[PDB]
């Protein structure tokens, strides 16, 4: 009973209301829905969306903001059929709108699971102590912020499925539980496992730094006790779910043959971060994060980690770190990365022979270590995921709002600092190097001082960065990041991932709360843009070619990807074949060049 | 951590691999996927080779080829060579090497390798158990020592113990070969979605009190009342704990949250999973009902779910069959009985219903039935054993049927005649007199033994397996769904495949290889029992001629082929006869014996 105590009628009702509100907003944004304006209820501002069959009506109020952003009011949402009101039920919403939303017969039931799971997660979150944005901002507690996020991805509606976790596993492993996790360590035979080190890393010292000499010794003692030579093995940390549910079954042959040997649990307590299988070391915050392979489904992908990709991983991070260090614009912004410093991959030789390069069976056992940002900060400074800037607490108060307030700066001065730290590097990376990232909430950490963004740190590099120049000259080990993207889609890396998928929400949240107008938000973005471009006149040709101030850019729809295919939302053999562009949005930078 | 994988060691894995490759060679040969080439020397001819798709790896072995194209590949003889050199025997590599020969597609191969890995892991676990001889097992009289002591699993299917969905910890808690006590989780399910169906003589309120006790039912009522709910609005449903923790609480979270399902906690009685994994025998009270539960795990081509919709007819089908058996003088004479599915409960997740068609696994996630125990029926000096036991061989190769023969003091053929009258004649007569067929394999038959002799057979797994092969059969409305339309030329496969090729093939081979009784006499006994049955019912002589048990040949129906083609839904339930894989014919061992 304890495990399901969060699942009560009142919390489920609230969870449903929240999710339907989001569904209406975001599926409207994506043009799957087209709400009809009704004539004036309380001076107007009321819409209706009808079911596929027209019999059920979802009515609501909304404020429509820039980038076709629908701020659907959660308390206004009502559902009617036959003159009568019905309860708001997310499952029924998806069934009723299944043809409208483009959910096929094959996908609908699995997507309903994902929705059920997301809703369950909201119920769990509703049980947590309900901290205001102001309290969270005053805590200075990096992990209170990390584990206190509630929305998840702001676009995807089915965003917290974590399908593969039973409820007990949810409670042990989901980031919002803040449950401490001990990693399981394996010894992997060197005929199948390879460790790759970044600049300045050496394996023996590395694992001793991370585990301590005592634990390494103990692990050696496990090996010796079974008649194995430690020299023949490399250490690999695994997510306990992966061990108990996958490696001990799927990779039973490896365990049995002694290709993999279970060494026990490491001592240190870790916290799952937003990405679920990346772990922060709570016992020793200055130690590395550990990113693990986790074969659970979330937001269109299994959370596996490719063994083959590990070999290039530290080298790519070294390349990028060195590039950042060398670039005066980037220096001025204060940008840094937390490097993926070391990685270990395991090649299951028989699954390899049985599969192609894209199979999830090749992504079941690998790990990387990413440096902590904690040692880099000074006293006075605190850390927060950038996802926090779009967080709203239980009363609707923006966490960015709370930072603004604590800073004592005007909203636009506060924004300027954030934009110089986070945004300008994206501009300059694009224009100077053809370099893009995946710079969403969870892949940026903010360094804060008295509520002000002093600098931003990027993470999740090797698997996300791209150089949009198929002829790029790059060190051989990093040349796999060069890609061929049509010229007319290159700038979507900013317009989609920054503007439509992050700023859309940030600017809406701030305006709705009365803190700063969309006008001034986007003015500030424009001013920062212009000031950057004026500072690098040698790139003026490029600034003209790829116009940040163009009147429109494509609407790239995110939910549509998942609704079309919620198991492999992107074909990795053809990743740009997934993109779903549906008309254009007016650029809020238009007319501000 | 270590304890959970302790069974996985190089020596046990090596032995597991040798056993599985032995079986693969045998059974895929039987299924004509493989065609071993006889090499010169070493026996009468007796040494064979099978080569990899690309020709470069050779699997060499000895075998004795017995009736029904049964290849008794000798496990110790199996070797693997490539480029003049010997390699270890590795089942994974076997499947990879033979992928095209076996017809494993790109999509299926990796999941099939999982199932193999899991089956192999299970063999390793079983190798860690105390190694009881067939003689000790036979002397024990312990029904559940037999049930949980079986090692082979299905004798045809090579990937037969996948149980994919169990993590290793769950394997150890739930797999039948562990003999681990399981407690059921009880739910209260709201009557707008759940329905209880009773067999003749069953009434819900007394039934649940008989099974749980009034103290527990009252306590469960008190749980509901404590949340402001009326017990009158709810029915009790027992669930497999795996299903609860892994599926119901997630996939059916809306039901838990809305109070459509309320968790009442664990039941007190300890159950043991039977061979079928999600059917539970009450070890605390062996005379109480079995509980068969919905379990969304993958094993031998199917999820182990339980259809809510089918529950409504389930007790009625069992009542019809039990009354039919009781009325039939031939069946009376054999001693046949069933253990009835007496009560059932199904839950309809109304939203999943609207989102799916009738065949979806989402409709099979929450249902249960109760099946009566055979234990109260037996008398002093009688003991029970799954029929699967008759094809069990112990660690030394000794047949459990052999051990029963020995304990009986009968000749092998006298012992066989008793078994055949109890188990096999009812199948014949069911077919000829009623067009009625079952799924009469090892796990669906329980033997009643007295002094090593089979005194009578008890069938189980009725509502989901029985069929009447006459689409115009007149049947009570509630049971008419069992009527099916099978081409005339396929009807008798129900005996030829399921009894002869899938069970007797092994039994006869096991007995002969151990020196107990020749195949010739085994099949003579089968033939004699058949003739004596048919002589006793001359009113059916025209039907006996039309569907000839003594025909020279019958189709080879291949089982592994079904799973290799599709290891997730091996049969499309929207077209169940579209799955059948008939590949040429076998010589009937009854040919010439009519
Ligand atoms: Cl993260
Ligand atoms: Cl990450
Ligand atoms: Cl069973």
């Amino acid at each position: 009973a304890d495990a399901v105590a969060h699942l009560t009628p009142e919390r489920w009702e609230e969870a449903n209301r929240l999710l339907v509100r989001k569904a209406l907003a975001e599926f409207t944004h994506e043009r799957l829905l087209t709400p009809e304006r009704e004539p004036d209820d309380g001076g107007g501002q009321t819409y209706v969306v009808r079911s596929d069959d027209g019999q059920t009506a979802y009515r609501f109020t909304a404020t429509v903001r820039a980038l076709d952003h629908w701020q659907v009011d959660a308390a206004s949402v009502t559902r009617h059929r036959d003159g009568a009101e019905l309860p708001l039920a997310a499952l029924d919403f998806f069934i009723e709108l299944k043809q409208t939303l483009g959910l096929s017969d094959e996908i609908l039931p699995v997507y309903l699971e994902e929705i059920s799971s997301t809703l369950s997660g909201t119920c769990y979150k509703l049980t947590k102590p309900q901290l205001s944005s102001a309290e969270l901002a005053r805590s200075g507690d990096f992990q209170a912020v990390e584990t206190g996020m509630t929305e998840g991805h702001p676009c995807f509606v089915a965003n917290n499925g974590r399908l593969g976790f039973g409820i007990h596993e949810y409670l042990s492993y989901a980031p919002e539980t803040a449950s401490p996790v001990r990693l399981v360590w394996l010894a992997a035979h060197r005929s199948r496992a390879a460790f790759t080190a970044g600049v300045g890393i050496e394996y023996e010292s590395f694992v001793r730094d991370e585990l301590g000499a005592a634990t390494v010794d103990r692990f050696h003692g496990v090996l010796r006790g079974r008649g194995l030579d430690p020299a023949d093995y490399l250490l690999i940390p695994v997510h306990p779910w992966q061990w108990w549910n996958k490696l001990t079954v799927t990779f039973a042959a490896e365990v049995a043959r002694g290709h993999l040997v279970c060494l026990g649990e490491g001592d240190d307590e870790y916290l799952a971060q937003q990405s679920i299988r990346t772990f922060f070391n709570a016992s020793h915050p200055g130690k590395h994060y550990v990113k693990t392979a986790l074969s659970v489904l979330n937001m269109g992908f299994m959370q596996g980690l490719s063994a083959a990709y590990m070999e290039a991983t530290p080298a790519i991070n070294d390349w990028l770190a060195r590039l950042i260090e060398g670039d005066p614009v980037l220096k001025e912004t204060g940008l840094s990365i937390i490097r993926e410093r070391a990685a270990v991959g395991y090649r299951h030789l028989e699954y390899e022979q049985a599969t192609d390069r894209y199979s999830p069976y090749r992504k079941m056992l690998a790990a990387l270590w990413r440096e902590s940002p904690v040692p880099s900060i000074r006293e006075g400074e605190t850390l927060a995921t950038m996802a926090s800037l779009v967080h709203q607490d239980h009363e609707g108060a923006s966490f960015a709002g709370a930072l603004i307030e604590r800073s004592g700066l005007t909203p636009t001065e506060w924004l300027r600092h954030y934009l110089r730290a986070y945004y300008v590097p994206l501009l300059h990376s694009f224009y100077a190097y053809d370099l893009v990232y995946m710079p969403h909430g969870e892949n940026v950490i903010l360094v804060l001082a008295d509520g002000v963004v002093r600098r931003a740190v990027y993470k999740d590099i090797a698997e996300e960065i791209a150089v949009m120049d198929p002829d790029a000259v790059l060190p051989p080990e990093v040349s796999r990041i060069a890609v061929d993207v049509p010229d007319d889609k290159k700038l979507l890396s900013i317009f989609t991932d920054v503007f439509d998928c992050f700023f859309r929400f940030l600017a809406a949240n701030l305006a709705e709360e009365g803190i700063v107008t969309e006008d001034a938000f986007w003015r500030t973005v424009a001013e920062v843009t212009r000031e950057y471009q004026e500072s690098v006149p040698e790139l003026a040709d490029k600034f003209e070619r790829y116009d940040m101030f163009a009147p429109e850019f494509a609407l790239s729809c995110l939910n549509r990807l998942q609704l079309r295919d919620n198991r492999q939302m992107v074909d990795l053999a053809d990743p740009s074949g997934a993109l779903q562009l549906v008309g254009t949005l007016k650029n809020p930078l238009a007319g501000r060049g």
Side-chain angles (χ1 to χ4, degrees), chain A:
Chain A
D2 288 345
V4 294
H6 59 293
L7 300 175
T8 58
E10 308 87 340
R11 287 185 275 265
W12 185 255
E13 188 187 343
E14 178 65 12
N16 280 262
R17 174 167 298 278
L18 294 167
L19 191 140
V20 173
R21 180 223 76 80
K22 186 184 187 169
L24 286 162
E26 292 306 301
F27 298 150
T28 298
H29 177 74
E30 300 188 28
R31 308 189 187 164
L32 291 166
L33 309 179
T34 57
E36 188 196 338
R37 180 72 178 290
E38 314 225 78
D40 98 322
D41 191 15
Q45 192 222 173
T46 116
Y47 297 91
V48 57
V49 165
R50 294 198 189 70
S51 56
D52 291 350
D53 76 4
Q55 304 301 298
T56 302
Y58 291 86
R59 282 196 180 72
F60 56 94
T61 67
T63 296
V64 180
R65 294 190 175 285
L67 296 167
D68 304 355
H69 183 65
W70 284 68
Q71 200 164 68
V72 171
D73 176 68
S76 72
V77 183
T78 65
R79 172 181 183 212
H80 319 258
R81 170 195 307 163
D82 309 322
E85 180 146 358
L86 297 169
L88 279 188
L91 299 188
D92 304 53
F93 179 91
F94 289 104
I95 293 168
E96 285 168 352
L97 283 162
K98 71 190 171 162
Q99 294 199 333
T100 304
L101 305 174
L103 271 157
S104 64
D105 288 348
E106 193 166 314
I107 303 298
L108 178 55
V110 186
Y111 185 90
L112 294 185
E113 291 193 78
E114 291 193 276
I115 292 291
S116 297
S117 187
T118 293
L119 284 165
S120 294
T122 298
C123 293
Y124 177 82
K125 284 174 277 185
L126 291 167
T127 74
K128 291 176 74 176
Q130 294 293 283
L131 304 190
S132 62
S133 286
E135 293 176 73
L136 250 203
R138 175 171 43 267
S139 76
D141 181 332
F142 180 30
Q143 297 293 307
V145 179
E146 188 76 13
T147 69
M149 297 297 89
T150 57
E151 183 62 23
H153 195 289
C155 302
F156 288 100
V157 174
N159 65 356
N160 286 142
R162 289 74 162 280
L163 289 186
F165 287 168
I167 203 151
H168 57 311
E169 291 165 332
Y170 173 85
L171 293 167
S172 295
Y173 304 131
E176 59 266 39
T177 65
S179 288
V181 179
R182 293 187 191 228
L183 303 178
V184 168
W185 283 82
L186 304 182
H189 197 268
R190 282 168 178 274
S191 63
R192 292 181 181 217
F195 177 89
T196 299
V199 172
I201 294 293
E202 181 270 316
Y203 178 73
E204 293 295 345
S205 64
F206 182 82
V207 295
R208 288 178 182 73
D209 289 346
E210 275 294 305
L211 288 165
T215 292
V216 175
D217 178 77
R218 178 179 295 293
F219 292 177
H220 282 210
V222 175
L223 292 172
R224 288 183 161 114
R226 294 193 50 316
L228 302 172
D229 191 336
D232 289 331
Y233 290 84
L234 290 169
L235 298 172
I236 303 189
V238 309
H239 190 305
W241 183 100
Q242 194 77 347
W243 172 244
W244 289 104
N245 289 311
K246 294 292 173 172
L247 302 171
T248 54
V249 183
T250 313
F251 288 25
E254 304 313 88
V255 176
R257 286 177 298 173
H259 293 170
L260 286 173
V261 179
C262 187
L263 297 169
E265 283 181 328
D267 285 334
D268 286 356
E269 286 181 343
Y270 290 83
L271 290 171
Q273 307 297 274
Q274 290 170 97
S275 62
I276 309 153
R277 48 57 177 272
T278 298
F279 287 101
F280 179 77
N281 192 323
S283 299
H284 294 289
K287 291 180 182 188
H288 294 82
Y289 297 90
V290 179
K291 189 186 188 167
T292 66
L294 177 71
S295 298
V296 301
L297 177 76
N298 203 60
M299 277 185 288
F301 287 108
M302 309 306 293
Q303 305 301 307
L305 187 63
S306 168
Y309 270 12
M310 292 307 91
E311 185 189 334
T313 283
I316 293 162
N317 283 253
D318 293 334
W319 171 81
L320 178 54
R322 290 166 66 86
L323 181 168
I324 292 167
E325 186 178 19
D327 182 289
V329 169
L330 305 176
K331 182 179 158 169
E332 175 68 25
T333 69
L335 182 69
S336 64
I337 64 174
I338 46 172
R339 294 170 293 179
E340 298 146 356
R341 299 286 291 141
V344 60
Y346 187 97
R347 294 179 48 198
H348 190 304
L349 296 184
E350 295 82 15
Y351 287 115
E352 211 166 81
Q353 293 168 67
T355 58
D356 73 26
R357 67 201 295 170
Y358 306 114
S359 173
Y361 286 91
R362 299 195 185 195
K363 300 186 187 184
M364 293 178 74
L365 185 52
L368 67 69
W369 294 258
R370 180 182 297 120
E371 68 198 332
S372 179
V374 174
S376 73
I377 65 181
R378 300 184 285 188
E379 163 81 23
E381 292 178 336
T382 61
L383 291 162
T385 176
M386 187 178 76
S388 72
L389 297 191
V390 294
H391 174 78
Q392 294 169 287
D393 73 9
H394 67 289
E395 307 277 15
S398 173
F399 182 85
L403 297 178
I404 290 168
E405 174 69 19
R406 161 148 181 271
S407 80
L409 298 179
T410 69
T412 58
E413 292 163 328
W414 182 96
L415 286 165
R416 179 172 341 275
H417 286 283
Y418 163 55
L419 295 168
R420 294 168 46 92
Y422 154 71
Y423 168 69
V424 169
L426 304 175
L427 300 179
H428 187 63
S429 290
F430 174 88
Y431 291 110
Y433 299 107
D434 300 306
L435 168 63
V436 296
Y437 312 81
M438 176 51 54
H440 62 202
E442 80 183 17
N443 286 343
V444 179
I445 299 166
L446 303 174
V447 178
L448 301 172
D450 292 322
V452 183
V453 178
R454 189 160 277 176
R455 58 187 177 87
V457 174
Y458 300 172
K459 56 164 276 281
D460 195 5
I461 293 311
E463 289 194 281
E464 294 293 359
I465 66 167
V467 171
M468 298 185 304
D469 176 5
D471 299 326
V473 189
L474 295 164
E477 39 297 351
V478 337
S479 57
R480 63 168 232 215
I481 75 179
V483 299
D484 183 7
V485 168
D487 290 353
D488 72 7
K489 291 164 164 43
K490 293 178 174 164
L491 248 184
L492 296 177
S493 303
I494 307 297
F495 292 142
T496 311
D497 292 332
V498 184
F499 286 11
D500 198 49
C501 296
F502 197 74
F503 289 175
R504 177 162 62 96
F505 301 99
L506 178 62
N509 288 358
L510 297 168
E512 155 261 297
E513 191 164 346
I515 295 170
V516 57
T517 58
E518 301 169 58
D519 290 336
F521 179 91
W522 292 104
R523 190 192 70 200
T524 308
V525 176
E527 284 169 356
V528 170
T529 308
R530 288 198 304 267
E531 283 172 38
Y532 159 65
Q533 294 183 346
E534 282 181 274
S535 83
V536 193
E538 61 268 29
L539 294 175
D541 290 342
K542 206 169 162 170
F543 298 150
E544 185 63 13
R545 172 79 198 74
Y546 296 98
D547 189 357
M548 278 306 299
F549 303 94
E552 292 181 2
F553 52 79
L555 169 66
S556 180
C557 300
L558 270 62
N559 287 279
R560 284 191 194 240
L561 307 175
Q562 187 188 26
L563 295 162
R564 184 182 288 270
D565 190 325
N566 66 329
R567 199 68 92 308
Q568 190 61 37
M569 175 171 91
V570 176
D571 185 358
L572 314 154
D574 183 1
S576 69
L579 194 82
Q580 279 192 52
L581 302 183
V582 177
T584 55
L585 297 169
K586 295 198 202 182
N587 180 5
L589 283 193
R592 300 185 186 272

